[PDB]
Each structure stands twice: as C-alpha cells, then as structure tokens.
C-alpha cells in the first residue's frame, strides 16, 4: 500500500506517533516520505548485506529478522516481513523502540539529512486529524 500524506499522518497519530519522544507528527510523516515515499512494501539492500524494510525503512542489522543478515539481532521481535504490511502497527511499534535507543530520529539518516531543522509542519498542513 502507498499511503496518502494525510492518510499516514492520521494512521500515525492513531498509533501514538504524534510527539512520541518529543517528535511531532510532522517529523514522522517527513521521515516516511524520503525513506519510503509512503510505500509500505519498500525494501533496500544495503552494502553491509542488511536490508531496510517498510514505511520507515527499518534495518535488519538490529531490529527485525529476515534470516539472511549474518550476526544480526531481532530487537523488535518481528520478522522483517511484518514491516511491509499495509497495517503499520509493527512499523510503529518498532519505530517507537528505535527512537528510544539514544540518538532520537537521527537513527533515520534521511531524517537527519532531509527533515531535521526544516518546517516539518508542512507535512501535516491542512490534514484533518
């Protein structure tokens, strides 16, 4: 599923992502845009053999199990496949965890590079919430 901007914003809000760890909804929606372009089935193979999955491009090195990442861990206790679901509950559950690891949303490079500092409110502008 490809989410519409305001559609994800709402789904995210429903799921407790609005201002979690102090990150307004705008940040989260912005993170998703560049990471995945709102597409839930997005994957990307990194140079280190791990793979990013889902709307928030969550990595297999640490956070989910895909059975082909030598020496990895399954912090969020899920198969990576769950992160590609149209229902974003697991993408959120694990993101709530990733963001609590110590460095905030900086764990999402695309966030650090393309969202951090910018008028992130623009991504929730004129949505019903």
From Swiss-Prot:
C-type lysozyme domain boundaries: 1-129
Record: active site: 35, 52
GO CC annotations, alphabetized: cytoplasm; endoplasmic reticulum; extracellular space
Compartments where found: Secreted
Binding positions (substrate): 101
Keywords recorded for this protein, A-Z: Allergen, Antimicrobial, Bacteriolytic enzyme, Disulfide bond, Glycosidase, Hydrolase, Secreted, Signal
S-S bonds: 6-127, 30-115, 64-80, 76-94
The keyword Signal belongs to this UniProt entry's keyword annotation: yes
E.C. code: 3.2.1.17
Role this protein plays: Lysozymes have primarily a bacteriolytic function; those in tissues and body fluids are associated with the monocyte-macrophage system and enhance the activity of immunoagents. Has bacteriolytic activity against M.luteus.
Quaternary structure annotation from Swiss-Prot or TrEMBL: Monomer.
Protein name (record): Lysozyme C
UniProt organism field: Gallus gallus
């Amino acid at each position: 599923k490809v989410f519409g901007r305001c559609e994800l914003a709402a789904a995210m809000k429903r799921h407790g992502l609005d201002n979690y760890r102090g990150y307004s909804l705008g940040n989260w929606v912005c993170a998703a845009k560049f990471e995945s372009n709102f597409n839930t089935q997005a994957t990307n193979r990194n140079t280190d053999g791990s793979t990013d999955y889902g709307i928030l491009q969550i990595n297999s090195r640490w956070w989910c199990n895909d059975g082909r990442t030598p020496g990895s861990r399954n912090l969020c206790n899920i198969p990576c496949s769950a992160l590609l679901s149209s229902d974003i509950t697991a993408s959120v559950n694990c993101a709530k965890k990733i963001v609590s690891d110590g460095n905030g949303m900086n764990a999402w490079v695309a966030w650090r590079n393309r969202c951090k500092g910018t008028d992130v409110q623009a991504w929730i502008r004129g949505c019903r919430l």
